[PDB]
Amino acid sequence: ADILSEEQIVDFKEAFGLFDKDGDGCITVEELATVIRSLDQNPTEEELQDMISEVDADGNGTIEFDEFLSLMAKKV
Ligand SMILES: [Mg+2]
Ligand SMILES: [Mg+2]
């Protein structure tokens, strides 16, 4: 139970808008995937499978704003 960090909201947003031009706003599973590799982190993939598959409400198999925030709320 936590919330993203302000300064961290901008940092990620900047990288999001840079990697997201389609303007579609939302992103797929692959988009974030790669971004995960570039990010100097080491998160368990097993989780993503559980979350993404347990978060994808739209059922389109794609990540979105809320969907992304929810993943962090639990993960973080
Ligand atoms: Mg996109
Ligand atoms: Mg979705």
Q: How far is the CA of 73 from the centre of ligand 1 (A)?
A: 21
Both tokens of 54, joined, read: 């347990």
Of the bound ligands, which one is closest to the alpha carbon of residue 67?
2
User: Are 55 and 67 contacting, i.e. CB atoms less than 8 angstroms apart?
Assistant: yes
Instruction: Classify the C-alpha dihedral 39-52-64-1 as positive or negative.
Output: negative
Q: How far is the CA of 13 from the centre of ligand 1 (A)?
A: 13
At 63, is the secondary structure helix, strand, or coil? strand
Residues 76, 72: Cα–Cα separation, whole Å:
5
**Domains of the chain, residue spans:** 1-76
Residues 39, 55: Cα–Cα separation, whole Å:
22
Q: How far is the CA of 62 from the centre of ligand 2 (A)?
A: 4
Cα–Cα distance list, 56 to 30, 52, 69 (Å): 14, 6, 12
Method by which this entry was solved: NMR
Q: Which amino acid is at 21?
A: K
Q: How far is the CA of 52 from the centre of ligand 2 (A)?
A: 8
Residues 42, 37: Cα–Cα separation, whole Å:
8
Backbone φ and ψ for 67, nearest 5 degrees, come out as -50, -40
User: Are 76 and 4 contacting, i.e. CB atoms less than 8 angstroms apart?
Assistant: yes
What is the largest distance, in Å, between two alpha-carbon atoms of the chain? 32
